[PDB]
Amino acid sequence: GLKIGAWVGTQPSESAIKSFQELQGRKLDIVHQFINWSTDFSWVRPYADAVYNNGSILMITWEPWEYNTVDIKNGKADAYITRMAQDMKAYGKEIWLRPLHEANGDWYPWAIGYSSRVNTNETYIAAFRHIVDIFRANGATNVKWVFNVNCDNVGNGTSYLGHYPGDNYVDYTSIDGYNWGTTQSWGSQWQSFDQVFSRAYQALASINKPIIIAEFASAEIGGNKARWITEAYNSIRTSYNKVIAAVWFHENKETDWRINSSPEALAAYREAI
Numbered sequence: 001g002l003k004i005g006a007w008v009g010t011q012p013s014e015s016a017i018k019s020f021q022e023l024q025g026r027k028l029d030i031v032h033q034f035i036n037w038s039t040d041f042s043w044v045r046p047y048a049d050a051v052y053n054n055g056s057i058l059m060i061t062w063e064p065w066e067y068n069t070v071d072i073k074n075g076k077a078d079a080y081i082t083r084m085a086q087d088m089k090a091y092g093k094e095i096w097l098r099p100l101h102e103a104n105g106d107w108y109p110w111a112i113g114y115s116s117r118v119n120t121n122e123t124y125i126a127a128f129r130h131i132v133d134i135f136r137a138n139g140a141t142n143v144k145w146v147f148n149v150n151c152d153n154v155g156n157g158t159s160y161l162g163h164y165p166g167d168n169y170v171d172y173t174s175i176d177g178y179n180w181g182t183t184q185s186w187g188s189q190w191q192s193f194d195q196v197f198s199r200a201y202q203a204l205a206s207i208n209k210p211i212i213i214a215e216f217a218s219a220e221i222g223g224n225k226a227r228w229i230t231e232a233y234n235s236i237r238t239s240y241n242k243v244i245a246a247v248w249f250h251e252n253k254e255t256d257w258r259i260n261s262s263p264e265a266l267a268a269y270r271e272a273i
């Protein structure tokens with residue numbers, strides 16, 4: 001069965017996880033959290049314990065604001081990486097780790113499309129492989145590696161697979177994508193789940209790895225979010241057969257992505273999962 005996940009809009013304490021399960025009316029199979037590259041495992045541990053105590057898998061998006069691909073490739077973050085690997089091995093439990101995500105965009109300082117041009121496919125791949133090498137050298141085979149793309153290539157030099165580090169370094173591929181509706185002054189439009197995800201999925205479906213929808217959500221404005229949710233999950237089950245997990249992004253942020261942005265959205269979400 002499709003694994004159901006979320007970023008719940010806050011750090012996943014025991015009570016945040018339980019509250020989201022009451023909200024969506026179902027267990028969370030996967031709990032998503034975001035951390036940077038100046039956060040040690042000791043800070044993660046009480047969250048990880050809440051996730052595992054609930055019978056869920058923790059997925060961490062591990063964001064190197066503090067080191068770009070050149071820094072990482074060159075070994076300048078290795079002390080930090082090594083401690084994380086040691087600590088995660090000692091912890092022992094199955095963790096899905098998603099480092100250097102959305103690198104086919106232009107908004108992160110490790111991304112290929114980032115305006116300084118410092119990150120290339122070569123430096124990205126070398127960085128990703130270097131991280132995985134350190135984890136394996138430290139015995140952290142409990143850590144599963146998640147490659148990621150944004151649904152669209154944004155910025156110069158970006159592509160779905162140019163930065164792919166190889167099947168020997170990846171356990172899961174993944175896609176992030178949003179229906180922005182008409183909410184953005186950059187001229188956004190309502191897009192169905194297919195309109196958002198199909199192109200990236202076709203590219204990743206060429207790789208013999210399972211796929212996670214690591215982040216998705218819909219706006220309320222410009223269409224019927226309840227129907228979008230119903231149709232999204234139908235589409236995942238019907239036509240995105242390599243997808244093994246769907247992880248909503250539940251936060252009132254750029255727009256109201258939450259599953260409870262309206263009562264009707266919530267009801268549709270509860271039924272869809």
Ligand SMILES: OC[C@H]1CN[C@H](O)[C@@H](O[C@@H]2O[C@H](CO)[C@@H](O)[C@H](O)[C@H]2O)[C@@H]1O
Pocket residue numbers: 034063102176178215251253254
């Ligand atoms: O633009 C919508 C989302 C696209 N995917 C990004 O990963 C999201 O940004 C992350 O959001 C989390 C949760 O708010 C932050 O902790 C991360 O630092 C951030 O990169 C983005 O909101």
